[PDB]
Design a protein around this motif. Structure first.
Motif, PDB file in Angstrom:
ATOM      1  N   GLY C   1     -60.824 -17.011  70.740  1.00  8.07           N
ATOM      2  CA  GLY C   1     -62.165 -17.110  70.188  1.00  8.07           C
ATOM      3  C   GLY C   1     -62.147 -16.960  68.680  1.00  8.07           C
ATOM      4  O   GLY C   1     -61.362 -17.603  67.979  1.00  8.07           O
ATOM      5  N   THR C   2     -63.026 -16.096  68.169  1.00  8.96           N
ATOM      6  CA  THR C   2     -63.106 -15.863  66.732  1.00  8.96           C
ATOM      7  C   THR C   2     -61.877 -15.156  66.173  1.00  8.96           C
ATOM      8  O   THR C   2     -61.718 -15.109  64.950  1.00  8.96           O
ATOM      9  CB  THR C   2     -64.357 -15.048  66.397  1.00  8.96           C
ATOM     10  N   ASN C   5     -55.878 -17.688  65.593  1.00 11.30           N
ATOM     11  CA  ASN C   5     -55.254 -18.085  64.332  1.00 11.30           C
ATOM     12  C   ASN C   5     -55.598 -17.110  63.207  1.00 11.30           C
ATOM     13  O   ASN C   5     -55.832 -17.510  62.064  1.00 11.30           O
ATOM     14  CB  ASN C   5     -55.640 -19.517  63.950  1.00 11.30           C
ATOM     15  N   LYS C   6     -55.618 -15.818  63.538  1.00 13.36           N
ATOM     16  CA  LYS C   6     -55.936 -14.751  62.586  1.00 13.36           C
ATOM     17  C   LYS C   6     -57.297 -14.979  61.934  1.00 13.36           C
ATOM     18  O   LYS C   6     -57.456 -14.885  60.715  1.00 13.36           O
ATOM     19  CB  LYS C   6     -54.838 -14.606  61.527  1.00 13.36           C
ATOM     20  N   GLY C   7     -58.290 -15.281  62.763  1.00 13.15           N
ATOM     21  CA  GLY C   7     -59.640 -15.500  62.281  1.00 13.15           C
ATOM     22  C   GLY C   7     -59.792 -16.767  61.462  1.00 13.15           C
ATOM     23  O   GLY C   7     -60.282 -16.731  60.334  1.00 13.15           O
TER      24      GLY C   7
ATOM     25  N   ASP E   3     -49.699 -22.698  61.001  1.00 11.54           N
ATOM     26  CA  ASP E   3     -50.342 -21.611  61.721  1.00 11.54           C
ATOM     27  C   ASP E   3     -50.281 -20.320  60.916  1.00 11.54           C
ATOM     28  O   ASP E   3     -49.287 -20.033  60.242  1.00 11.54           O
ATOM     29  CB  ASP E   3     -49.684 -21.414  63.084  1.00 11.54           C
ATOM     30  N   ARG E   4     -51.358 -19.545  60.982  1.00  9.87           N
ATOM     31  CA  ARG E   4     -51.417 -18.236  60.338  1.00  9.87           C
ATOM     32  C   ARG E   4     -50.575 -17.285  61.171  1.00  9.87           C
ATOM     33  O   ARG E   4     -51.056 -16.640  62.103  1.00  9.87           O
ATOM     34  CB  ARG E   4     -52.857 -17.756  60.215  1.00  9.87           C
ATOM     35  N   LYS E   6     -48.602 -14.314  62.749  1.00  3.00           N
ATOM     36  CA  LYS E   6     -48.708 -12.865  62.854  1.00  3.00           C
ATOM     37  C   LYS E   6     -47.628 -12.382  63.804  1.00  3.00           C
ATOM     38  O   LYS E   6     -47.627 -12.747  64.984  1.00  3.00           O
ATOM     39  CB  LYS E   6     -50.090 -12.435  63.350  1.00  3.00           C
ATOM     40  N   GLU E 462     -71.515 -13.356  65.773  1.00  2.00           N
ATOM     41  CA  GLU E 462     -70.986 -13.747  67.075  1.00  2.00           C
ATOM     42  C   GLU E 462     -72.070 -13.716  68.142  1.00  2.00           C
ATOM     43  O   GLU E 462     -72.196 -14.653  68.941  1.00  2.00           O
ATOM     44  CB  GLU E 462     -69.834 -12.830  67.475  1.00  2.00           C
ATOM     45  N   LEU E 466     -73.063 -17.369  69.573  1.00  2.00           N
ATOM     46  CA  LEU E 466     -72.224 -17.666  70.727  1.00  2.00           C
ATOM     47  C   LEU E 466     -72.824 -17.186  72.043  1.00  2.00           C
ATOM     48  O   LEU E 466     -72.575 -17.787  73.090  1.00  2.00           O
ATOM     49  CB  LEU E 466     -70.836 -17.052  70.540  1.00  2.00           C
TER      50      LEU E 466
ATOM     51  N   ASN F  14     -64.737 -26.929  65.250  1.00  2.00           N
ATOM     52  CA  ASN F  14     -64.537 -25.685  65.976  1.00  2.00           C
ATOM     53  C   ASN F  14     -65.702 -24.754  65.681  1.00  2.00           C
ATOM     54  O   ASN F  14     -66.027 -24.515  64.515  1.00  2.00           O
ATOM     55  CB  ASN F  14     -63.210 -25.036  65.579  1.00  2.00           C
ATOM     56  N   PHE F  16     -65.899 -21.488  66.515  1.00  2.00           N
ATOM     57  CA  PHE F  16     -65.442 -20.178  66.070  1.00  2.00           C
ATOM     58  C   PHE F  16     -65.220 -20.163  64.564  1.00  2.00           C
ATOM     59  O   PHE F  16     -65.527 -19.171  63.889  1.00  2.00           O
ATOM     60  CB  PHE F  16     -64.165 -19.789  66.810  1.00  2.00           C
ATOM     61  N   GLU F  17     -64.683 -21.255  64.019  1.00  2.57           N
ATOM     62  CA  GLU F  17     -64.550 -21.371  62.571  1.00  2.57           C
ATOM     63  C   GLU F  17     -65.914 -21.362  61.896  1.00  2.57           C
ATOM     64  O   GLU F  17     -66.077 -20.782  60.818  1.00  2.57           O
ATOM     65  CB  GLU F  17     -63.787 -22.644  62.209  1.00  2.57           C
ATOM     66  N   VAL F  19     -68.605 -19.808  63.002  1.00  5.22           N
ATOM     67  CA  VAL F  19     -69.087 -18.429  63.039  1.00  5.22           C
ATOM     68  C   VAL F  19     -68.387 -17.590  61.980  1.00  5.22           C
ATOM     69  O   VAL F  19     -69.021 -16.791  61.279  1.00  5.22           O
ATOM     70  CB  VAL F  19     -68.901 -17.837  64.448  1.00  5.22           C
ATOM     71  N   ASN F  20     -67.069 -17.758  61.845  1.00  6.45           N
ATOM     72  CA  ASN F  20     -66.329 -16.998  60.841  1.00  6.45           C
ATOM     73  C   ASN F  20     -66.794 -17.333  59.428  1.00  6.45           C
ATOM     74  O   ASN F  20     -66.950 -16.438  58.590  1.00  6.45           O
ATOM     75  CB  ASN F  20     -64.831 -17.253  60.987  1.00  6.45           C
TER      76      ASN F  20
END
Ligand SMILES: [Mg+2]
Lengths: 76, 49, 17, 63, 611, 81, 152
Positions: C1-2, C5-7, E3-4, E6, E462, E466, F14, F16-17, F19-20
């Motif tokens: 979700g949010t 990909n680390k936000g 990709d980020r 982690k 959120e 959502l 997307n 979620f993007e 929302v962020n």
RNA sequence: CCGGCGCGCG
């Protein structure tokens, strides 16, 4: 189209020459021949075999008589 | 997830897999094409537990 | 979700006039 | 920070009365630290490590 | 896109006595918990203030104070009492005791790594059995093999008398030993690579030759698999027998303290002697502390109640993992009975004044202070407690635009928790929209809901973007609508759209209706009681043919000699001409169908116009 | 605002993007001007209105509206459930 | 390099196999195979211009065969299988066979090391690359020792 | 501010 190995897609044509072949029976003649060849090739590369190495190969030739190999092992 | 594993058979012994080891299906098939070191396996059905 | 990909030049150098 | 993060519960009480944005806790809550000590009582050590994607330095999280 | 990345990990490993000391460094030596009179932490006890940290942060065991390192008299640190939740101690066991998990659990790891039957190790650790030739890396001179159950008669008197005492004890623990010490010595001097090679060669020998011919193979595969993992890791197989016993911080054990006492009770007894029986009592004390219930009969207390060990408190449905970590109780949450509100919007809910003022208390304090109606936080809280009339204006102001999360108890799918815009309603009940009851599986016969307030801006975003109901009209299971009218609304629609009585239910005898220019005229006539809800009428239609009807030819065509002809269908009349291109349509319907169509059409048009 | 939220997501690959990004913009709004938000003006609503206004569609700022018919100070509307 | 690549992709220029290989050239020596494998997974399941080539497989294999702890023979075997399945687009070079011989030697999978050494023979340099100038415990010497010990 | 036992509600 899904039947292929690493040998037939990387061009390993030599692979079929080391498979589906009856292995060679071990014999003392074969062993001493390989020992002489290996010792010569190790000497050629700069690796010096020890005194004990030569004695073991020589005793192998004494076990199964092979006089034709005595003349070359001793001088080496 | 039920049908994604195979069971290394009891006679397939090497330094890559041990007999009875539970390995993934895709990993098993990829090692099959790359090695001939007794990669012997059979499909196993696992419960959700 | 949010969470996927680390936000300073041009100063003290003006024209004296 | 609504259940057990002791440090972050007190900061949330402060920011919301001044309306100045709540940051991420980034630390472990007291329920995870409670679990670690219990696992220590069974002679088991549980460490949390962070590996930097920049220089691959392993960082030990305080827990 | 890159990709980020982690890279975060956590790993468990069997711990070393040196790491236990580094944890404690700090040894608990006495079984005293508190003074019977003063209720102060006994020194060197299970709650010792020097070992674990200062109760009443910033004070010593004496009573001195400093502003928030070590004291001189009692040697207590000057830190917060937080440390009492994290600082560990240790118990210096006189004799090593095996870890119950690695000996008694099936299959035994110690038994497989040492390659002896489990009963033999159990007899060695619990019964009075002595093991011959415990180590190999040191020479011996005897021919005792296996684990002789009976004590050797010569080894009891003859050899000790001939070899005296000092030197005999110096070389004693190299040919014969007993208990967990022998097991730890066997584990310490193991050569893992030799184990792997011997297991592999024995497996090959077995294979080259049918139940236990296979079960022995599986042991060999298991043992060399077990042996390999020790080589590549930093774990040592002798850590499965404990030399030190880490002690839980006191603030986590404000039952467990009873088991810690017994270890000290029997270990301090053993060091006074320095005998075989007391060594076993220490081992059983550690087993009960670590894991009760595996040894058959579990040790009980004076009330004939089974003790609870660390394994019991970390495992099970009520354990740490499944009860404390996977679910938590939260602040800023409320609960009340839910009642139906049919006037609510689909994105709104009703909150009682008490629940709202509790949940939004900090925001109400900020609202009070911001407009200079409260001097400080304390005055604002006092005003909130007094139910001042200006508290409710600020509450109503701050609740605007701040969503809340509702939740019914059996959350079977994700629509069991949804987000709504709260409004202040009178009473003590939560007002819920009727169309969201099916998603919650809620009816108004006693059900209750929990309310949660997102605090940070990310959580509010959120919840708003959502979790609101107007964006969750479809169920994820199959994709069917979830907010569909049910029961009373469905009955109302069914009655509204049930058309005219027809045939023998309309006329008593075999037949051998008003005309309205527009639907508004028909509805107005219905309001003035001129027509009924299901009485037939003809409606002039000035749009395209869009009436669902059976695909049938006209019942009767009335063709005039002037060119015009009337086509009469089951539900509409169409007037056409050959001279002109005119085409008139009249629909035979009721006020109910008109009302349903107009309701949907006006909803669409009003939503379009409002934007 | 529900229609506006649906409209903004028609241009987002997307959600979620989305929302962020909205949360980050609201955080910037609050950090720059703390005192202007929390009451009648909400930061997220301001972000949504600005993103709608950036398309050329006029909207009231932060969807902030009041009741012109309140009968003086102290009177609170009683909702009819 | 990672910061600049992130900024480059933010500016509108996506990274290709070249940039990913440059990044992997440093990740393969960190002692943690998971970093290089995360980069490889990013490459493999991405766009056509991000797809791995021989150098990428070499970097990931080198990362796995020179790991600090745990066994990585299964990982290297699966990577080899994945590279084989990609034959229509990727082919090996001298470094691939050198790394594979080293890996299958250190884990005592001697016959696979023999196969890949036969493959390595056809390249000039060859055993000189495998020798690694004596570094990493001299994989050529270990291969010779493994051949001697088993009587091959 | 800890656990058991009993009774209930949805
Ligand atoms: Mg109910």
């Amino acid at each position: 189209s899904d039947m292929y190995t690493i040998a037939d897609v990387w061009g390993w044509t030599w692979e079929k020459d080391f498979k589906n072949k009856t292995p060679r029976r071990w014999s003392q003649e074969w062993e001493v021949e390989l020992a002489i060849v290996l010792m010569a090739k190790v000497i050629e590369l700069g690796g010096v075999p020890t005194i004990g190495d030569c004695a073991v190969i020589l005793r192998a030739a004494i076990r199964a008589p092979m006089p034709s190999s005595f003349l070359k092992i001793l001088q080496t | 997830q039920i049908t994604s594993k195979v069971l290394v058979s009891e006679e397939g012994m090497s330094n890559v897999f041990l007999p009875g080891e539970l390995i993934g299906l895709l990993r098993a098939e990829r090692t099959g094409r790359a090695l001939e070191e007794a990669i012997c396996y059979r499909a196993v059905l696992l419960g959700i537990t | 979700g949010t969470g996927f990909n680390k936000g300073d030049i041009l100063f003290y150098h003006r024209e004296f006039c | 920070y609504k259940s057990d993060h002791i440090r972050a519960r007190q900061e949330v009480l402060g920011t919301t009365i001044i309306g100045g944005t709540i940051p991420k806790p980034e630390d472990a809550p007291e329920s995870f630290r409670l679990l670690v000590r219990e696992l220590r009582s069974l002679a088991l050590e549980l460490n949390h490590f962070l590996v930097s994607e920049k220089n691959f330095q392993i960082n030990r999280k305080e827990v | 896109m890159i990709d980020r990345y982690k890279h975060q990990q956590l790993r468990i490993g069997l711990v070393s006595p040196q790491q236990i000391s580094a944890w404690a460094t700090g040894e608990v030596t006495k079984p005293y918990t508190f003074h019977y009179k003063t209720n102060k932490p006994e020194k060197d006890g299970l709650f010792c203030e020097r070992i674990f940290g200062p109760i009443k942060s910033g004070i010593c065991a004496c009573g001195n104070y400093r502003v928030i390192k070590f004291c001189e008299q009692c040697g207590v640190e000057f830190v917060d009492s937080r440390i009492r939740r994290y600082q560990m101690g240790y118990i210096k066991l006189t004799c090593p005791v095996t870890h119950v998990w690695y000996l008694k659990r099936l299959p035994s790891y110690i038994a497989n790594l040492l390659d002896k039957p489990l009963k033999e190790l159990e007899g060695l650790v619990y019964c009075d059995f002595s093991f011959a030739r415990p180590i190999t890396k040191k020479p011996t001179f005897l021919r005792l093999r296996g684990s002789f159950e009976y004590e050797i008669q010569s080894w009891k008197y003859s050899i000790p008398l001939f070899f005296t005492t000092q030197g005999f004890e110096i070389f004693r623990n190299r040919e014969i030993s007993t208990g967990a010490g022998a097991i730890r010595e066997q584990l310490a001097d193991l050569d893992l690579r030799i184990i792997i090679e011997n297991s592999l060669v024995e497996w090959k020998q077995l294979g080259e030759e049918d139940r236990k011919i296979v079960r022995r193979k599986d042991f060999l595969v298991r043992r060399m698999e077990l042996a390999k993992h020790f080589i590549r890791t930093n774990i040592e197989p002798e850590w499965m027998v404990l030399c030190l016993l880490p002690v839980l911080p006191p603030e986590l054990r404000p039952d467990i303290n009873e088991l810690y006492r017994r270890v000290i009770y029997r270990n301090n007894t053993l060091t006074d002697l320095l005998v075989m029986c007391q060594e076993k009592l220490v081992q059983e004390a550690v087993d009960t502390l670590l894991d009760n219930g595996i040894r058959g009969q579990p040790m009980r207390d004076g009330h004939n109640k089974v003790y609870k060990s660390f394994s019991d408190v970390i495992e099970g449905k009520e354990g740490r993992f499944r009860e404390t970590l996977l679910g938590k109780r939260v602040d800023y949450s409320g609960r009340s009975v839910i009642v139906v509100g049919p006037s609510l919007s689909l994105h709104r809910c009703g909150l009682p004044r008490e629940i709202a003022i509790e949940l939004f208390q900090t925001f109400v304090i900020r609202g009070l202070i911001r407009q200079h109606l409260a001097s400080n936080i304390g005055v604002a809280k006092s005003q909130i407690r007094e139910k001042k009339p200006i508290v409710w204006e600020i509450l109503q102001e701050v609740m605007q635009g701040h969503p809340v999360l509702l939740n019914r108890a059996p959350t079977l799918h994700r629509l069991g928790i949804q987000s709504f815009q709260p409004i202040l309603v009178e009473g003590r009940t939560i007002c819920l929209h009727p169309l969201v009851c099916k998603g919650f599986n809620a009816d108004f016969d006693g059900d209750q809901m929990a309310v949660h307030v997102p605090l940070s801006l990310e959580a509010q975003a959120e919840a708003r973007l959502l979790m609101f109901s107007h964006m969750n009209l479809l169920s994820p299971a199959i994709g069917d609508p979830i907010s569909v009218p049910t029961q009373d609304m469905l009955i109302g629609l069914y009655v509204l759209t049930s058309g005219t009585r027809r045939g023998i239910c309309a006329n008593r005898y075999n037949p051998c209706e008003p005309f309205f220019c527009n639907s508004y005229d028909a509805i107005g006539a219905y309001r003035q009681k001129r027509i009924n809800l299901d009485s037939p009428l003809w409606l002039r239609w000035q749009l395209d043919q869009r009436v669902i009807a059976s695909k049938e030819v006209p019942i009767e065509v009335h063709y005039e000699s002037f060119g015009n002809y009337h086509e009469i269908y089951a539900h509409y009349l169409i007037v056409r001409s050959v001279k002109k291109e005119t085409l008139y349509i009249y629909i035979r319907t009721t006020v109910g169908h008109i009302s349903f169509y107009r309701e949907i059409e006006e909803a669409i048009q009003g939503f379009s116009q409002a934007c | 605002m529900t229609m506006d939220i649906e409209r903004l997501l028609l241009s987002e690959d997307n959600r979620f993007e989305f929302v962020n990004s909205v949360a980050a913009e609201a955080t910037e709004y609050v950090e720059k001007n703390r005192d202007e938000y929390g009451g009648t003006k909400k930061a997220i609503f301001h972000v949504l209105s600005n993103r709608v206004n950036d398309l050329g569609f006029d909207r009231p700022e932060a969807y902030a509206e009041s009741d012109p018919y309140k009968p003086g100070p102290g009177y609170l509307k009683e909702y009819y459930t | 390099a990672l910061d600049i690549s992130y900024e480059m992709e933010a500016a509108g220029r996506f990274a290709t196999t070249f940039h990913f290989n440059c990044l992997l050239s440093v990740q393969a020596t960190c002692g943690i195979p998971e970093v290089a494998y995360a980069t490889f997974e990013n490459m493999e399941y991405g766009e056509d211009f991000m797809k791995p080539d021989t150098e990428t497989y070499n970097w990931v294999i080198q990362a796995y065969t020179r790991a600090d702890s745990y066994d990585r023979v299964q990982d290297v075997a699966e990577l080899l299988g994945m590279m084989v399945e990609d034959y229509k687009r990727v082919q090996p070079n001298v470094k691939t066979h050198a790394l594979l011989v080293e890996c299958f030697t250190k884990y005592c999978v001697v016959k696979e090391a023999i196969r890949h050494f036969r493959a390595l023979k056809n390249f000039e340099g060859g055993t000189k690359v495998l020798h690694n100038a004596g570094n990493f415990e001299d994989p050529l010497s270990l291969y010779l020792r493994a051949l001697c010990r088993e009587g091959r």
